Enzyme design. Structure first.
Site, PDB file in Angstrom:
ATOM      1  CD  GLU A 281      -2.942  -0.788  -0.045  1.00 33.05           C
ATOM      2  OE1 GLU A 281      -3.481   0.326  -0.212  1.00 33.05           O
ATOM      3  OE2 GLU A 281      -3.106  -1.738  -0.834  1.00 33.05           O
ATOM      4  CD1 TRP A 284      -1.040  -0.483  -4.332  1.00 32.40           C
ATOM      5  CD2 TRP A 284      -1.657   0.877  -5.998  1.00 32.40           C
ATOM      6  NE1 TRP A 284      -1.507  -1.268  -5.363  1.00 32.40           N
ATOM      7  CE2 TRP A 284      -1.892  -0.458  -6.397  1.00 32.40           C
ATOM      8  CE3 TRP A 284      -1.966   1.916  -6.885  1.00 32.40           C
ATOM      9  CZ2 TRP A 284      -2.425  -0.784  -7.650  1.00 32.40           C
ATOM     10  CZ3 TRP A 284      -2.497   1.593  -8.136  1.00 32.40           C
ATOM     11  CH2 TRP A 284      -2.720   0.252  -8.504  1.00 32.40           C
ATOM     12  CD1 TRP A 312     -17.400  15.691 -17.184  1.00 41.55           C
ATOM     13  CD2 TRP A 312     -18.076  13.846 -16.113  1.00 41.55           C
ATOM     14  NE1 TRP A 312     -16.305  14.878 -17.023  1.00 41.55           N
ATOM     15  CE2 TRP A 312     -16.691  13.736 -16.369  1.00 41.55           C
ATOM     16  CE3 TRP A 312     -18.726  12.799 -15.445  1.00 41.55           C
ATOM     17  CZ2 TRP A 312     -15.942  12.620 -15.983  1.00 41.55           C
ATOM     18  CZ3 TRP A 312     -17.980  11.685 -15.057  1.00 41.55           C
ATOM     19  CH2 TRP A 312     -16.601  11.607 -15.329  1.00 41.55           C
ATOM     20  CG  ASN A 347      -9.033   2.385  -0.219  1.00 44.24           C
ATOM     21  OD1 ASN A 347      -9.055   1.324  -0.842  1.00 44.24           O
ATOM     22  ND2 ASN A 347      -8.770   3.548  -0.801  1.00 44.24           N
ATOM     23  CD1 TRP A 365     -13.488  11.765 -12.813  1.00 41.77           C
ATOM     24  CD2 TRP A 365     -12.293  13.104 -11.470  1.00 41.77           C
ATOM     25  NE1 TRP A 365     -12.230  11.888 -13.358  1.00 41.77           N
ATOM     26  CE2 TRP A 365     -11.477  12.704 -12.556  1.00 41.77           C
ATOM     27  CE3 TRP A 365     -11.753  13.952 -10.495  1.00 41.77           C
ATOM     28  CZ2 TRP A 365     -10.147  13.126 -12.692  1.00 41.77           C
ATOM     29  CZ3 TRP A 365     -10.426  14.373 -10.632  1.00 41.77           C
ATOM     30  CH2 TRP A 365      -9.643  13.957 -11.724  1.00 41.77           C
ATOM     31  CD1 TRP A 388     -11.278  12.105  -5.543  1.00 43.67           C
ATOM     32  CD2 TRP A 388     -13.219  11.529  -6.498  1.00 43.67           C
ATOM     33  NE1 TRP A 388     -12.240  12.083  -4.556  1.00 43.67           N
ATOM     34  CE2 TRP A 388     -13.442  11.734  -5.117  1.00 43.67           C
ATOM     35  CE3 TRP A 388     -14.298  11.154  -7.310  1.00 43.67           C
ATOM     36  CZ2 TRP A 388     -14.702  11.578  -4.528  1.00 43.67           C
ATOM     37  CZ3 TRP A 388     -15.553  10.996  -6.726  1.00 43.67           C
ATOM     38  CH2 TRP A 388     -15.745  11.209  -5.347  1.00 43.67           C
TER      39      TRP A 388
HETATM   40  C1  LIG Z   1     -11.589   8.446  -4.045  1.00 37.91           C
HETATM   41  C2  LIG Z   1     -10.355   8.260  -3.156  1.00 37.91           C
HETATM   42  C3  LIG Z   1      -9.762   9.339  -2.527  1.00 37.91           C
HETATM   43  C4  LIG Z   1      -8.667   9.134  -1.710  1.00 37.91           C
HETATM   44  N1  LIG Z   1      -8.210  10.214  -0.972  1.00 37.91           N
HETATM   45  C5  LIG Z   1      -7.037  10.029  -0.235  1.00 37.91           C
HETATM   46  C6  LIG Z   1      -6.457  11.247   0.279  1.00 37.91           C
HETATM   47  O1  LIG Z   1      -6.875  12.388   0.112  1.00 37.91           O
HETATM   48  N2  LIG Z   1      -5.320  11.029   1.078  1.00 37.91           N
HETATM   49  C7  LIG Z   1      -4.715   9.790   1.335  1.00 37.91           C
HETATM   50  O2  LIG Z   1      -3.635   9.682   1.905  1.00 37.91           O
HETATM   51  N3  LIG Z   1      -5.258   8.738   0.615  1.00 37.91           N
HETATM   52  C8  LIG Z   1      -6.454   8.747  -0.079  1.00 37.91           C
HETATM   53  N4  LIG Z   1      -7.079   7.618  -0.591  1.00 37.91           N
HETATM   54  C9  LIG Z   1      -6.436   6.425  -0.469  1.00 37.91           C
HETATM   55  C10 LIG Z   1      -6.940   5.715   0.790  1.00 37.91           C
HETATM   56  O3  LIG Z   1      -8.358   5.565   0.844  1.00 37.91           O
HETATM   57  C11 LIG Z   1      -6.111   5.765   2.087  1.00 37.91           C
HETATM   58  O4  LIG Z   1      -4.814   6.359   2.046  1.00 37.91           O
HETATM   59  C12 LIG Z   1      -6.824   5.884   3.434  1.00 37.91           C
HETATM   60  O5  LIG Z   1      -8.058   5.171   3.552  1.00 37.91           O
HETATM   61  C13 LIG Z   1      -5.863   5.662   4.583  1.00 37.91           C
HETATM   62  O6  LIG Z   1      -6.343   4.821   5.635  1.00 37.91           O
HETATM   63  P1  LIG Z   1      -5.191   4.126   6.492  1.00 37.91           P
HETATM   64  O7  LIG Z   1      -4.204   5.158   6.897  1.00 37.91           O
HETATM   65  O8  LIG Z   1      -5.793   3.293   7.548  1.00 37.91           O
HETATM   66  O9  LIG Z   1      -4.550   3.199   5.341  1.00 37.91           O
HETATM   67  P2  LIG Z   1      -3.755   1.801   5.445  1.00 37.91           P
HETATM   68  O10 LIG Z   1      -4.596   0.758   4.839  1.00 37.91           O
HETATM   69  O11 LIG Z   1      -3.234   1.573   6.816  1.00 37.91           O
HETATM   70  O12 LIG Z   1      -2.548   2.089   4.432  1.00 37.91           O
HETATM   71  C14 LIG Z   1      -1.335   2.712   4.928  1.00 37.91           C
HETATM   72  C15 LIG Z   1      -0.927   3.964   4.140  1.00 37.91           C
HETATM   73  O13 LIG Z   1      -0.751   3.693   2.737  1.00 37.91           O
HETATM   74  C16 LIG Z   1      -1.253   4.820   1.979  1.00 37.91           C
HETATM   75  N5  LIG Z   1      -2.342   4.355   1.088  1.00 37.91           N
HETATM   76  C17 LIG Z   1      -3.210   3.286   1.239  1.00 37.91           C
HETATM   77  N6  LIG Z   1      -4.057   3.165   0.264  1.00 37.91           N
HETATM   78  C18 LIG Z   1      -3.579   4.042  -0.699  1.00 37.91           C
HETATM   79  C19 LIG Z   1      -4.001   4.361  -2.016  1.00 37.91           C
HETATM   80  N7  LIG Z   1      -5.026   3.734  -2.617  1.00 37.91           N
HETATM   81  N8  LIG Z   1      -3.457   5.465  -2.619  1.00 37.91           N
HETATM   82  C20 LIG Z   1      -2.517   6.182  -1.977  1.00 37.91           C
HETATM   83  N9  LIG Z   1      -2.021   5.957  -0.751  1.00 37.91           N
HETATM   84  C21 LIG Z   1      -2.608   4.861  -0.160  1.00 37.91           C
HETATM   85  C22 LIG Z   1      -1.731   5.880   2.995  1.00 37.91           C
HETATM   86  O14 LIG Z   1      -0.659   6.778   3.278  1.00 37.91           O
HETATM   87  C23 LIG Z   1      -2.010   5.028   4.221  1.00 37.91           C
HETATM   88  O15 LIG Z   1      -1.963   5.768   5.459  1.00 37.91           O
HETATM   89  C24 LIG Z   1      -8.118   7.845  -1.540  1.00 37.91           C
HETATM   90  C25 LIG Z   1      -8.706   6.764  -2.203  1.00 37.91           C
HETATM   91  C26 LIG Z   1      -9.829   6.956  -2.973  1.00 37.91           C
HETATM   92  C27 LIG Z   1     -10.495   5.772  -3.672  1.00 37.91           C
END
Ligand SMILES: Cc1cc2nc3c(=O)[nH]c(=O)nc-3n(C[C@H](O)[C@@H](O)[C@@H](O)COP(=O)(O)OP(=O)(O)OC[C@H]3O[C@@H](n4cnc5c(N)ncnc54)[C@H](O)[C@@H]3O)c2cc1C
Length: 473
Positions: A281, A284, A312, A347, A365, A388
């Site tokens: 993650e 990513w 849109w 997420n 979006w 997005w």
């Molecule tokens: C529409 C949309 C908008 C999003 N907006 C944000 C946002 O503004 N800021 C944000 O940091 N992430 C965003 N995410 C990604 C994501 O949902 C998470 O980073 C968030 O849920 C973190 O929860 P956690 O810290 O428990 O993650 P964990 O599952 O513990 O993951 C650990 C770390 O990995 C990173 N991470 C995990 N998933 C992703 C991913 N898909 N993309 C990028 N980094 C990721 C984050 O830094 C996170 O703290 C977005 C995803 C979607 C689908």
């Protein structure tokens, strides 16, 4: 000749690349943070983020005092105030960690140029990524727009370890303080003084100490079940470290090290797998940050040519209902409620509500991207834009056209409607079966609204618009 370290999204004293590099050059190390009106006054700033930020700064002030110096606070335009501050202090140099976003990079170029004109060195190092954007390139020396190959490269690269926390600093003297008096705030402004209010809590409490504690706790237990617990919103299966990573309350090398140590400690194949999945993650995260760095136009909106022309529908009333958790789709409303009330969303839920806004409501979006930025405690341009663009496969790592069925998603990731009932208590009397299908009887619906759209009809509409456009082109 002191050295100034300019903090922006690295609000911690530990495992900080630029800070450690600065300390190796001088003990007369003074930290600084500048409240930039272009950032703070933006309509896209989220109260929850200001609250978390403010809390991180309070601790950083203490860390510097304990280390031996202090954290200078300024409010105004960086390219004007920072050079002036450095000049008044006859600073040997100003250090800071590089940004990946358009605004920050443009700002930094200007500050660095102003400092150069003043004969003051400016050192900009990479800190928030395990690998800088220039270290991860294809065989032809080009950036990646597809995840698979990026991961194959990124995963094989040697990983950096945490750097040392600076100690034994030398504070500024009264004469030096007099020289900069006009440029400083006497104290860190309170959230209310800044005109913001937030009482919804945080995924992890503000500050370096809380972030490090959370990382240790997560890697000590929960990380082992990350796969598949990461898939269910009702479960607290994720780290909740997102705002700590966005604001650097925790160092990325610290995060990688803790997970790496947990993997080496584990003797369970399932646990090892869960830890590897969490580590990916972080991959990513770098994929999207590197993408924003290499392709800054991603921030402008739909990236791929076809999507720049998508018709849109943009019915404001539908967008409004989405923002107020009044869509009539339980899984979506519970998620939107969690966002507005706590500044964070699981997420799987972000994926669900994003797909709904884009595919079901057919709203540009960028409206959703903006709403998320106005409410997320972890609002991050790279990850948010990535999420997005993902909702339409309009950017990086595009996939074939697909439209989530809210009911299908709810049944799969919230099978007993535990998450739904948690955020929509006024529907706790409804059977999970109906909350998942989204088909609730008017009597049991009470004040809860009916579905604002018919999924089947919206799905056909979106596909029709897509296919018609794809054909025209
Ligand atoms: C529409 C949309 C908008 C999003 N907006 C944000 C946002 O503004 N800021 C944000 O940091 N992430 C965003 N995410 C990604 C994501 O949902 C998470 O980073 C968030 O849920 C973190 O929860 P956690 O810290 O428990 O993650 P964990 O599952 O513990 O993951 C650990 C770390 O990995 C990173 N991470 C995990 N998933 C992703 C991913 N898909 N993309 C990028 N980094 C990721 C984050 O830094 C996170 O703290 C977005 C995803 C979607 C689908």
């Amino acid at each position: 000749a002191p050295i100034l370290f300019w903090h922006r999204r690295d609000l911690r004293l530990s495992d900080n690349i630029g800070l450690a590099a600065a300390r190796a050059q001088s003990a007369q190390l003074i930290g600084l943070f500048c409240l930039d009106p272009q950032i703070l006054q933006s309509a896209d700033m989220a109260p929850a983020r200001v609250a978390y930020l403010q809390g991180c700064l309070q601790e950083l002030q203490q860390r510097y005092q304990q280390a031996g110096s202090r954290l200078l606070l300024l409010q105004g335009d960086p390219q004007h105030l920072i050079p002036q501050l450095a000049q008044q202090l006859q600073a040997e140099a100003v250090y800071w960690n590089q940004d990946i976003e358009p605004y920050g990079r443009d700002r930094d170029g200007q500050v660095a140029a102003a400092l150069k004109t003043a004969g003051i060195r400016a050192v900009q190092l990479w800190d928030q990524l395990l690998h800088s954007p220039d270290q991860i390139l294809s065989g032809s020396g080009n950036p990646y727009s597809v995840y698979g190959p990026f991961w194959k490269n990124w995963q094989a690269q040697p990983k950096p370890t945490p750097v040392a926390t600076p100690t034994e600093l030398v504070d500024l003297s009264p004469e030096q303080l007099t020289a900069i008096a006009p440029l400083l705030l006497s104290e860190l402004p309170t959230l209310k003084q800044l005109g913001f209010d937030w009482d919804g809590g945080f995924p992890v409490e503000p500050g370096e100490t809380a972030a490090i504690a959370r990382l240790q706790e997560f890697c000590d237990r929960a990380i082992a079940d990350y796969d598949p617990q990461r898939n269910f919103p009702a479960e607290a299966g994720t780290s909740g470290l997102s705002p700590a990573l966005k604001f650097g309350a925790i160092g990325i090398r610290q995060a990688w090290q803790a997970a790496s140590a947990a993997h080496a400690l584990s003797r369970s194949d399932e646990a090892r797998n869960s830890i590897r999945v969490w580590q990916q993650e972080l991959a990513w995260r770098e994929f999207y940050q590197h993408a924003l760095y290499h392709f800054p136009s991603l921030a402008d909106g739909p990236y791929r040519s076809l999507w720049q022309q998508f018709p849109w529908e943009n019915r404001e009333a539908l967008f409004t209902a989405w923002t107020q958790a009044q869509t009539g789709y339980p899984i979506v409303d519970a998620a939107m409620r969690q966002l507005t009330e706590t500044g964070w969303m699981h997420n799987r839920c972000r994926m669900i509500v994003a797909s709904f806004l884009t595919k079901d409501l057919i709203i540009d979006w960028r409206r959703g991207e903006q709403f998320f930025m106005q409410h997320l405690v972890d609002g991050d341009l790279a990850a948010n834009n990535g999420g997005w663009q993902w909702s339409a496969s309009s950017g990086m790592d595009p996939k074939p056209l697909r439209i989530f069925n809210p009911a299908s998603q709810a049944k799969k990731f919230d099978a007993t409607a535990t998450y739904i009932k948690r955020w929509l208590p006024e529907l706790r009397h409804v059977h999970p079966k109906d909350l998942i299908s989204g088909e609730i009887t008017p009597i049991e619906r009470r004040g809860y609204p009916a579905p604002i759209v018919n999924h089947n009809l919206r799905q056909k509409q979106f596909k029709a618009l897509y296919n018609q456009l794809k054909a025209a082109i």
